[PDB]
Write a protein that binds this DNA or RNA. Sequence first.
RNA 1: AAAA
Length: 88
Amino acid sequence: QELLKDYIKRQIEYYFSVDNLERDFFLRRKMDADGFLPITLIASFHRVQALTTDISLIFAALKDSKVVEIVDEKVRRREEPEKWPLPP
RNA sequence: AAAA
C-alpha cells in the first residue's frame, strides 16, 4: 500500500502546514493545549476518507512524516505546536 | 469540509 500511503501522508501533511494552519480555525479549535488532535478526527476529513478508511494505514503514513509526530492516538505539528490551538 |  506504499503509493496510497504516500498520498495519505502528503494530504495530512498539508493540514499541518503553516499555510493551512493560518486559516484552519476548525482544526485549531479541536487541538488540545499542546497542539495534539485525534488521528481518528483526521481520518474523517473528506479527502482522507476518500483514499482510505484503514486506520493502521493512516498511522503508518504518519510515522513516515517529518512534519507531524504521533503520541499514542494523537498527532500534532512538530514545529512549535503550541502556536496554533484556539478557544472553542 | 473555501484541501474542515
